[PDB]
């Protein structure tokens, strides 16, 4: 089980694709919901995501079929297509997934943020960093639901620097484009969802606290946070969850005026990566860094709740720390950070001490020595 949100709001979930092309926005929306008696949300909704997952893990696509057998009916505790909770303007998080992931795989984060009164737009990237994604070749294909699938691209050694940087820049553009889509919907601009789903986008009219915008992401998505902030000032702060810094250009590091929070796992980080995080620091800039004790890279993803403790530890989906304990720390410290830098009038400041790494299961800053 993916945990339910800890906040007071019920959580809805829907998908939005606009336009229908490989250049349009595809996102999964998590939102405060009016109702709590809908069907739970299908975690991985299409067989082709399992094929892409199997390719990314370096197995035969038939292991994809076995993963589908084991996980294809798994749900996440968000009310599918629930009406939006009316009568409040919600701050907006745009969320960026890791390499091999896609929009649906950070629901523990998305649901928790929504349960505290956020709208969350979890982007599906079309940079070939997702294990799979889909779109429609044209308007006829969209109408009949004839999906075109795009699978993870594997790189040769000498494509690494260049293609990862091309990908992070496309990812930033996709985050900006998703923001603009949501902001235009918030006006009441008619948008016809390329997916035929029983959620009226007209509900989102006048629902966004238009100045309270953040970008959050894991791993590749953590780099995407930083790229996005340097190029789109509409984002007011960023949270990089165990950022993989390698994709970022040399130019970005001095170009991030917004507050930035690094939440790291203990066992992923390494000096080359920490050195790159430290390049984002300047005395005029607001920077914070914490490390979750006993955690691994995938503690931020829903894969951490998908198996038992032994299989979990074996597959590096779980660390020595309990997965619920770890995600609570990351989500609560995130809430306090967003309250501070978005200027929210909630009670998230109760977790301010977590921003400083002041907890038995937190390391202030980093465990990694860079000398």
Q: Which range of residues in 95-103, 132-140, 161-169, 285-293 is near ligand 6HV by CB under 6 A?
A: 95-103
Site string for ligand 6HV, 155-184 (x = CB under 6 A): ------------------------------
86 binds Cl ion (CB under 5 A): no
Query: Footprint of ligand 6HV on residues 47-66 (CB under 6 A)?
Result: 53, 56-57
- Our answer to whether residue 297 is catalytic in this structure is yes
Cβ neighbours of residue 314 closer than 8 Å, sequence gap 6 or more: none
Length of the chain: 371
- Our answer to whether residue 334 is catalytic in this structure is no
Q: Annotated catalytic residue: which of 207, 219, 265, 334?
A: 219
Q: Annotated catalytic residue: which of 242, 265, 328, 334?
A: 242
Residue 272 vs 311, nearer CB to Cl ion: 272
Query: What is the distance between the alpha carbons of residues 292 and 304, in angstroms, rounded to a whole number?
Result: 14
Left (φ > 0), alpha (ψ -120 to 50) or beta: where does 365 sit? left
Size of the site for Cl ion (CB under 5 A): 7
Query: Footprint of Cl ion on residues 261-280 (CB under 5 A)?
Result: 267-268, 270-272
Residue 121 vs 317, nearer CB to ligand 6HV: 317
Q: Annotated catalytic residue: which of 97, 116, 297, 341?
A: 297
User: Burial level of 151, CB count in 10 A (0-12/13-18/19+)?
Assistant: middle
101 binds ligand 6HV (CB under 6 A): yes
Size of the site for ligand 6HV (CB under 6 A): 15
At closest approach, how far in Å is the CB of 74 from ligand 6HV?
Answer: 8
- Our answer to whether residue 242 is catalytic in this structure is yes
Residue 131 vs 264, nearer CB to ligand 6HV: 131
Query: Footprint of ligand 6HV on residues 115-144 (CB under 6 A)?
Result: 131
At closest approach, how far in Å is the CB of 266 from ligand 6HV?
Answer: 17
306 binds ligand 6HV (CB under 6 A): yes
Q: Which of 303, 305, 337, 348 binds ligand 6HV (CB under 6 A)?
A: 303
At closest approach, how far in Å is the CB of 314 from ligand 6HV?
Answer: 10
244 binds Cl ion (CB under 5 A): no
At closest approach, how far in Å is the CB of 297 from ligand 6HV?
Answer: 8
Q: In what order do the strands lie in the sheet with 25-32?
A: 40-42, 75-80, 11-18, 25-32, 119-123, 90-96, 208-218, 237-241, 260-265, 287-292, 362-364
315 binds ligand 6HV (CB under 6 A): yes
217 strand-pairing partners? 96, 240
Cβ neighbours of residue 258 closer than 8 Å, sequence gap 6 or more: 229, 233, 235, 236, 237, 238, 286, 341
306 binds, among ligand 6HV, Cl ion, none (CB under 5 to 8 A by kind): ligand 6HV
Question: Which has the closest alpha carbon to 88: 204, 179, 213?
Answer: 204
Residue 86 vs 271, nearer CB to Cl ion: 271
Catalytic residues, which ones? Answer: 219, 242, 297
* Residues making contact with Cl ion (CB under 5 A): 267-268, 270-272, 296-297
> Footprint of ligand 6HV on this chain (CB under 6 A)?
53, 56-57, 67, 71, 98, 100-101, 131, 298, 303, 306-307, 315, 317
């Amino acid at each position: 089980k993916i945990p339910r949100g800890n906040g007071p709001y019920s959580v809805g979930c829907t998908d939005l694709m606009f336009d229908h092309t490989n250049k349009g926005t595809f996102l999964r929306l998590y939102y405060p919901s009016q109702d709590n008696d809908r069907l739970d949300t299908l975690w991985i909704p299409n067989k082709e995501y399992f094929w892409g997952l199997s390719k990314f893990l370096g197995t035969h696509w038939l292991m994809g079929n076995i993963l589908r057998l084991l996980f294809g009916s798994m749900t996440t505790p968000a009310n599918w297509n629930s009406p939006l909770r009316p009568g409040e303007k919600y701050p907006l998080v745009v969320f960026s997934h890791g390499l091999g992931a896609f929009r649906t795989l950070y629901s523990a984060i998305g649901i928790d943020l929504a349960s505290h009164g956020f709208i969350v737009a979890a982007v599906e990237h079309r940079d070939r960093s997702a294990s799979a994604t889909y779109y429609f070749k044209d308007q006829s294909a969209a109408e009949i639901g004839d999906k075109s699938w795009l699978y993870l691209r594997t790189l040769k050694q000498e494509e690494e620097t260049h293609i990862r940087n091309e990908q992070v820049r496309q990812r930033a553009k996709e985050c900006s484009q998703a923001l603009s889509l949501i902001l235009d919907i918030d006006h009441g601009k008619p948008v016809k969802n390329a997916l035929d789903l029983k959620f009226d986008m007209e509900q989102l009219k006048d629902s966004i606290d238009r100045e309270k915008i953040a970008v959050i992401g894991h791993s590749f998505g953590g780099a995407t946070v930083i790229q996005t902030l340097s190029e789109d000032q509409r984002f007011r702060c960023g949270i990089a969850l165990d950022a993989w810094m390698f994709p970022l250009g040399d130019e970005v590091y001095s170009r991030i005026p917004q507050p930035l929070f690094f939440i790291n796992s203990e066992y992923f980080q390494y000096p080359a990566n920490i050195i790159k995080m430290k390049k984002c620091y300047s005395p005029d800039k607001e920077r914070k860094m914490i490390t979750i004790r006993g955690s691994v890279h995938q503690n931020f993803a829903d894969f951490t709740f998908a198996t038992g403790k032994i299989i979990g530890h074996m597959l590096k989906l779980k660390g020595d720390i309990d997965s619920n304990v770890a995600i609570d720390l990351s989500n609560k410290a995130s809430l306090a950070f967003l309250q501070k830098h978005l200027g929210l009038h909630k009670d998230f400041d109760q977790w301010d001490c977590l921003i400083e790494g002041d907890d038995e299961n937190l390391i202030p800053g980093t465990n990694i020595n860079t000398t």
